[PDB]
């Protein structure tokens, strides 16, 4: 069982047992303390922050009766989101996205969920999470989360993930607004790269949102015996939210793709004016350089007499040629 | 079926999606073989009782930013709430749906 990810820094287990009467919260490093939590009737939430250390996930899967290939899927972080149903548990693979305003780059993090009897087995690659509002809602009595089973906890985690998907969409909306203003106001070189990078990020978001939509559709439309019908409308609501996300991603793709064509239509027309300038100045100064050199040969066969101001009348010829050529340019409106 | 859940709205909310919020009027044009009636108003109660009229009627509701009028008309005529949301949704493509 090999881990194919890039995060190998920290390991941490977060455990949150809650019921109607009181909650329990502790962060333990020893893995033996979380095992006796499966027999409790009250719901519980074991969150594993580091999955690079393989013995922990192997032990947890063996103790909870998780099939080894499901463990392989847990360790495989380069996997498309999916849901697979089992008679003892439901296995969900999702993705976690963080976006930076300072540097426009989209990164993905894989998270896995197992709902077996009352445990929500959360496997996370690294530190930094999405489900802080759920933790706050279960730490202080603030909602229905403390009155239902662990399937409602699975719903709450999925809903939190969708909510920060919405937050990411907000940040991208601001980026698109700023980029469109920049394109319309001050075209510049790196703006094209920014537009193309944003387009590719939107394509990646589309490709990662479709599997999430399939996940939610499978979760609510065909209810397993473990999900229970009392939670299906909540999953349907999250499915509708995912539909909203998909539509917004599509409209951002459409609008940003148009911005790329703005630079294309704003270029490839700077040649003519400078070409005309070069043509007219060369036309003016080639014959006038041929002359004043035709008489400046030092040929000395021409009579040396200055005559009636030969050099001034040559300058007058220069001016006459220049005036005539400018008149011809004006006739051709160059 | 069922109204689509929108994250940021109260459940069951109907929202006009387009941009135009300037004008609003209702124009009823009831007609038959022998006689016709042309009638314009800004009150929905004067256009509601044409639901059960035997002669053909053409009710034209201009301005869908008044979601209350759309909802009242749909309630009176039995139109499904999903159809009302589809009416209010302007970012669509042409489509036809058949109901009983």
């Amino acid at each position, epitope marked *: 069982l090999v881990y194919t990810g890039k995060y190998r820094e920290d390991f941490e287990i977060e455990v949150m047992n809650y019921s109607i009467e009181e909650f329990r919260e502790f962060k333990t490093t020893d893995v033996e303390s979380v095992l006796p939590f499966r027999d409790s009737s009250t719901p519980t939430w074991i969150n594993i922050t580091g999955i690079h250390r393989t013995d922990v996930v192997q032990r947890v899967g063996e103790f909870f009766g998780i099939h080894p290939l499901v463990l392989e899927d847990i360790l495989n972080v380069h996997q498309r989101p999916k849901v697979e149903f089992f008679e003892n548990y439901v296995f969900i693979v999702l993705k976690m996205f963080t976006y930076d305003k300072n540097l426009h780059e989209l990164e993905s993090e894989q998270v896995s969920l197992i709902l077996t009897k009352n445990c929500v087995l959360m496997f996370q690659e690294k530190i930094g999470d999405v489900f802080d509002p759920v933790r706050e809602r279960i730490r202080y009595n603030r909602g229905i989360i403390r009155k239902k089973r662990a399937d409602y906890l699975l719903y709450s985690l999925i809903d939190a993930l969708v909510d920060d998907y919405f937050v990411l*969409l907000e940040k991208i909306d601001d980026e698109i607004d700023v980029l469109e203003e920049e394109v319309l106001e001050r075209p510049e070189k790196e703006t094209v790269q920014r537009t193309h990078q944003l387009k590719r990020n939107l394509v990646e978001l589309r490709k990662t949102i479709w599997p999430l939509r399939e996940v939610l559709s499978s979760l609510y439309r065909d209810v397993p015996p473990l999900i229970e019908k009392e939670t299906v409308p909540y999953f349907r609501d999250v499915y509708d939210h995912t539909i909203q996300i998909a539509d917004t991603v599509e409209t951002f793709r459409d609008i940003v793709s148009g911005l790329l064509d703005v630079y294309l239509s704003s270029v490839s027309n700077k040649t003519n004016e400078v070409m005309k300038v070069l043509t007219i100045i060369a036309t003016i100064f080639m014959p006038l350089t041929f002359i004043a050199g035709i008489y400046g040969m030092n040929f000395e066969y021409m009579p040396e007499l200055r005559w009636k101001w030969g050099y001034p009348v040559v300058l007058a010829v220069m001016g006459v040629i220049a005036v005539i050529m400018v008149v011809y340019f004006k006739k051709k409106k160059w | 079926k069922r109204l689509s859940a929108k994250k940021g709205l109260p459940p069951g909310t109907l929202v006009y999606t387009g941009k135009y919020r300037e004008d609003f009027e209702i124009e009823v044009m009831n007609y038959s073989i022998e006689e016709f009636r042309e009638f314009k108003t800004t009150d929905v109660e004067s256009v509601l009782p044409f639901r059960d009229s035997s002669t053909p009627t053409w009710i034209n509701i201009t301005g869908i930013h008044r*979601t209350d009028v759309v909802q009242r008309v749909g309630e009176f005529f039995g139109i499904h709430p999903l159809v009302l949301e589809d009416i209010l949704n302007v970012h669509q493509r042409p489509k036809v749906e058949f109901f009983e």
Partner: antibody
Framework: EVQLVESGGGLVQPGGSLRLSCAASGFNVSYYSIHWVRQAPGKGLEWVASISSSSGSTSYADSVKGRFTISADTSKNTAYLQMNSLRAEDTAVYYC???????????????????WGQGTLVT | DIQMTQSPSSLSASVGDRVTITCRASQSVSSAVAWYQQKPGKAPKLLIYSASSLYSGVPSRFSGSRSGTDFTLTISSLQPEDFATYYCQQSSSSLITFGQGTKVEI
């Protein structure tokens, strides 16, 4: 046509309670959302609470959350703001307004307060 | 919570000139920003919604714009009736927050 009439403002001792009633005319409170905005003397507008009468959806400002309760009678077309445990910071001109939702993106929504009320003073 | 900061707190301008008031949001609000005009002793009056859309029955002088999280209210030509306090709110969340106001004076 569309008017919002407010009543229930008066002088109340600190720690007391009073109910503000908002009478709606020209529209039905079921199809819209009614908001409460208070304006302290010499200070800008502050949002108090909101309610969509069609559902049971309610929202309160963090400053007055828990102490204020909003509701509406659909039959009476009136919205109420039950404000208890008042302090000296709760004195302001309370405004009643209705809002409509508009569309920005599929994921984004906003509301704007098209019609307002005359205002009542509570100390 | 979303905090909207207005600048300047007070403004002085003549008649027929250009006036600009800018609103800044602490966090990201997409376009759910509105502008309200309140003469003293009266209720506010809606002017702009969606940060760029002019409300019905409002003079064409008023306008709005969005540049990221920066929102500006501009009056092309000031009028005697245009001397009042202006507010900006955000409607991106259920918790609606107003600005601190901007009183335009003669």
């Amino acid at each position: 046509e569309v008017q919002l009439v407010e009543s229930g403002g008066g002088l109340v001792q600190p720690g007391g309670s009073l109910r503000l009633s908002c009478a709606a005319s020209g529209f039905n409170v079921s199809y819209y959302s009614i908001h409460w905005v208070r304006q302290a003397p010499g200070k800008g507008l502050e949002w108090v609470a909101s309610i969509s009468s069609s559902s049971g959806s309610t929202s309160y400002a963090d400053s007055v959350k828990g102490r204020f309760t909003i509701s509406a009678d659909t039959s009476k077309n009136t919205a109420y703001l039950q404000m208890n445990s008042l302090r000296a910071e709760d004195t302001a001109v309370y405004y009643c307004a209705r809002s409509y939702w508009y569309y920005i993106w599929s994921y984004s929504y906003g509301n704007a307060m098209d019609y307002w009320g005359q205002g009542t003073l509570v100390t | 919570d979303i905090q909207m900061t207005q600048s300047p707190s007070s403004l002085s301008a003549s008649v027929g000139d250009r006036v600009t008031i800018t609103c800044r949001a602490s966090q990201s609000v997409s376009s759910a920003v509105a502008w309200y005009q309140q003469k003293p002793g009266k209720a506010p009056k809606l002017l702009i919604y969606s940060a760029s859309s002019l409300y019905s029955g409002v003079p064409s002088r008023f306008s709005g714009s969005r540049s990221g999280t920066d929102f500006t209210l501009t009056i092309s030509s000031l009028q005697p009736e245009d001397f009042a306090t202006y507010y900006c709110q955000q409607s991106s969340s259920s918790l609606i927050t107003f600005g601190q106001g901007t009183k335009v004076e003669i």
